[PDB]
Amino acid sequence: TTENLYFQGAMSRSYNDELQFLEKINKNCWRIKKGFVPNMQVEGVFYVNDALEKLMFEELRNACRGGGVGGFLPAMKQIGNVAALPGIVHRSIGLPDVHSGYGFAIGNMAAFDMNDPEAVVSPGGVGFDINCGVRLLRTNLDESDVQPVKEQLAQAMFDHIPVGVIPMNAKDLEEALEMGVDWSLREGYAWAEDKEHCEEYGRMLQADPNKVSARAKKRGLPQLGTLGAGNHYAEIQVVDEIFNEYAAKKMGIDHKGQVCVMIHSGSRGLGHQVATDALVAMEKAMKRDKIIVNDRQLACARIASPEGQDYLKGMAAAGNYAWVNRSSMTFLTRQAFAKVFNTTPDDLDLHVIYDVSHNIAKVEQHVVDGKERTLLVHRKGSTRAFPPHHPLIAVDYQLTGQPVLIGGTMGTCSYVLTGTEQGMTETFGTTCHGAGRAQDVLDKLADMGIAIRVASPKLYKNVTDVVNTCHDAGISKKAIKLRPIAVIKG
Ligand SMILES: [Mn+2]
Numbered sequence: 001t002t003e004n005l006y007f008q009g010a011m012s013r014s015y016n017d018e019l020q021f022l023e024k025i026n027k028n029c030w031r032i033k034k035g036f037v038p039n040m041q042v043e044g045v046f047y048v049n050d051a052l053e054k055l056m057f058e059e060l061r062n063a064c065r066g067g068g069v070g071g072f073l074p075a076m077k078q079i080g081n082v083a084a085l086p087g088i089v090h091r092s093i094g095l096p097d098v099h100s101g102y103g104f105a106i107g108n109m110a111a112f113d114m115n116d117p118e119a120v121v122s123p124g125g126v127g128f129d130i131n132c133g134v135r136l137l138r139t140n141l142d143e144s145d146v147q148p149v150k151e152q153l154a155q156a157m158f159d160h161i162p163v164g165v166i167p168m169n170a171k172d173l174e175e176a177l178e179m180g181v182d183w184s185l186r187e188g189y190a191w192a193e194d195k196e197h198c199e200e201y202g203r204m205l206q207a208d209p210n211k212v213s214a215r216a217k218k219r220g221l222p223q224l225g226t227l228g229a230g231n232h233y234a235e236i237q238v239v240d241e242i243f244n245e246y247a248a249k250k251m252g253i254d255h256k257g258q259v260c261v262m263i264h265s266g267s268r269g270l271g272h273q274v275a276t277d278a279l280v281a282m283e284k285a286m287k288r289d290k291i292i293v294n295d296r297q298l299a300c301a302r303i304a305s306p307e308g309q310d311y312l313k314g315m316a317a318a319g320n321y322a323w324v325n326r327s328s329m330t331f332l333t334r335q336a337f338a339k340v341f342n343t344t345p346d347d348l349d350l351h352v353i354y355d356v357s358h359n360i361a362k363v364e365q366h367v368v369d370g371k372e373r374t375l376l377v378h379r380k381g382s383t384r385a386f387p388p389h390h391p392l393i394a395v396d397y398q399l400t401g402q403p404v405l406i407g408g409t410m411g412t413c414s415y416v417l418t419g420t421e422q423g424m425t426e427t428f429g430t431t432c433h434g435a436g437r438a439q440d441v442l443d444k445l446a447d448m449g450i451a452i453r454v455a456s457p458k459l460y461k462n463v464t465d466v467v468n469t470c471h472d473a474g475i476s477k478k479a480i481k482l483r484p485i486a487v488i489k490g
Pocket of ligand 1 (some may be wrong): 358407
């Protein structure tokens with residue numbers, strides 16, 4: 001986020017001229033008027049509380065004022081660059097946890113009309129870790145039941161990570177990329193109820209393994225070497241607060257102190273490679289279709305392009321692979337819990353509460369200016385949050401709205417949110433994904449009471465401020481707060 005811009009204008013400005021393009025819509029939302037960056041097709045908006053508002057406008061002035069080396073790209077500027085993409089509708093939107101990233105800002109959503117021939121798809125609008133996501137499992141155990149054996153549970157979970165639960169040959173992987181969680185179901189590593197409580201039923205149709213490069217496929221095949229890359233993250237959690245008892249009851253969360261397990265994983269290097277190969281092929285074809293962007297990292301292809309069609313089919317394939325990896329972690333988590341407590345996984349009520357993505361592009365029906373349209377919704381660092389009574393969400397959540405899982409870092413709380421009708425109207429059903437940015441840790445976590453198994457010692461916008469901002473804006477609703485007692489990052 002520095003010299004990736006083409007030689008362009010609008011850069012002979014100071015903080016006061018940039019403030020001219022900025023107006024506050026309401027208590028929790030700001031407007032970016034056109035002209036903030038070149039070639040804006042729609043306006044931009046971001047959601048703030050008084051704290052996150054300070055950091056956003058400080059990051060603007062620190063880069064805008066200049067007077068030093070850097071030229072760092074503010075999140076407010078990347079929002080506008082995304083608003084300059086052909087095909088975008090409504091507005092490019094920054095969720096409360098918006099921070100700067102490759103082309104798109106992390107936490108910056110934008111949707112494109114699939115009936116517009118100039119509409120494009122941007123891999124930078126999905127992210128390199130395609131379909132990194134969160135999965136929440138409930139248990140019938142209480143904190144008093146788990147707190148004594150938390151070290152053994154964490155060790156058993158850590159020891160279960162390395163070992164056929166994951167596609168171990170290229171042929172199995174080609175099926176996993178095509179079938180998503182349907183591969184795990186056939187191979188015994190997933191329950192049927194896991195699919196019904198999973199975004200897109202754990203499988204994105206029309207995925208094509210032929211659109212995934214051979215290097216990408218080998219990046220996704222298991223390696224006994226190079227373990228410790230950090231792609232596996234798990235957290236044994238305790239229900240610390242229930243803001244909505246009925247939403248919690250429909251998720252099986254019966255009381256405070258109940259134990260849950262949170263799983264965080266993605267496509268590892270397969271998605272990184274799928275995103276990279278697309279970016280290269282798109283750079284070479286943007287001229288043929290005459291696409292103009294402000295940021296070279298906004299490299300995109302038209303949806304109708306062969307390169308745009310290839311990416312989405314490959315992107316869907318990596319998303320399927322990510323669900324297979326989280327199902328295998330579920331299978332190993334279920335096995336870890338089964339052995340420590342010496343029973344069967346079902347007798348511990350180890351069902352999937354929900355599973356969301358936050359690095360994916362989805363084809364969704366949305367109403368734009370009173371007209372139903374088919375939109376390609378880019379969500380990098382943002383979570384889908386469908387409202388109550390959406391016909392395509394689980395029957396169990398037809399009255400609560402779609403559960404939204406918020407990732408919590410080491411020692412940080414996690415949240416379960418619900419979708420809202422207001423979020424479908426304002427943000428196309430989009431909400432935050434977690435926190436943003438801009439041995440000592442070991443003893444702090446131990447003193448907090450958190451057992452920790454981490455492979456290598458190599459391994460801000462507060463999540464609380466972010467979820468409270470979304471709750472106040474009405475684009476999400478707080479339901480559960482979870483506290484970690486064991487963190488497993490291998
Ligand atoms: Mn993630």
